[PDB]
Design a protein around this ligand. Sequence first.
Ligand SMILES: C=C(C)[C@@H]1CC[C@]2(C(=O)O)CC[C@]3(C)[C@H](CC[C@@H]4[C@@]5(C)CC[C@H](O)C(C)(C)[C@@H]5CC[C@]43C)[C@@H]12
Length: 259
Amino acid sequence: NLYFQGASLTEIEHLVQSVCKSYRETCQLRLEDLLRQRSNIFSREEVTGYQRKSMWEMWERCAHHLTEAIQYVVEFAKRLSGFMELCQNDQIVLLKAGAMEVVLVRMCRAYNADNRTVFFEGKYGGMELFRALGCSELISSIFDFSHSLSALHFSEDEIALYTALVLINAHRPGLQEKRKVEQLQYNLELAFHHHLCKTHRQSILAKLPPKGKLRSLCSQHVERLQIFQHLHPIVVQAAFPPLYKELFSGGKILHRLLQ
Ligand SMILES: C=C(C)[C@@H]1CC[C@]2(C(=O)O)CC[C@]3(C)[C@H](CC[C@@H]4[C@@]5(C)CC[C@H](O)C(C)(C)[C@@H]5CC[C@]43C)[C@@H]12
């Protein structure tokens, strides 16, 4: 929109409010409900039930909860200034490469660093809950990532502006209108940095996760998905969500959602 060109301070400050609004309207669960349900945690019997579940059933349940989270990320993008003004090829390029990374950041709200548990299917559970997945190295890496993010003590507004920058990334391979994405990213970084300056919160800039860790977590996920697909190809074909397979398994629901 406007933010495909240079922006004044006043336009930057209103971009802050716009992004913070779009995130408030499109976050799956409210922070207050997540924090308040930390007292209810899975029993040792319930954890065993999850661990004794079959691998392909666990993978399918997790793929559906992941797809649900992606759907709110897509709606977040559609409410972001300039995203719908972009061409549809670039919209799909940004979502295909960022929607998972955004979910990985949003996840720190559902994570409790006090006991290293995460809110999953109604209760809080540690990473042993997912032992039936057979990717304990990836699970551990994601729990560590949420742990380091929780150390930053994000506000909701900070998560809003950070995840906006995760999505609007002009370096994604395949962008057709790169410079126009470059300007949108530039204005969104001013909005982010303006908010941190105003709230005396710039010290977190040097504490943010490095660029290659969100990309590395996403690669590990595609890595483990291909290993699961080789072991259970009909499960993926018959029971995985279409949006999930479009994003992480090559071969169009994004087209529909974007319109
Ligand atoms: C089985 C697969 C499709 C994924 C492959 C391994 C995996 C990965 O993505 O790396 C390991 C992390 C998990 C288990 C994903 C599946 C989605 C979930 C989920 C967002 C679901 C909704 C929940 O409320 C909560 C926010 C707590 C989790 C956080 C943990 C991950 C990201 C799996």
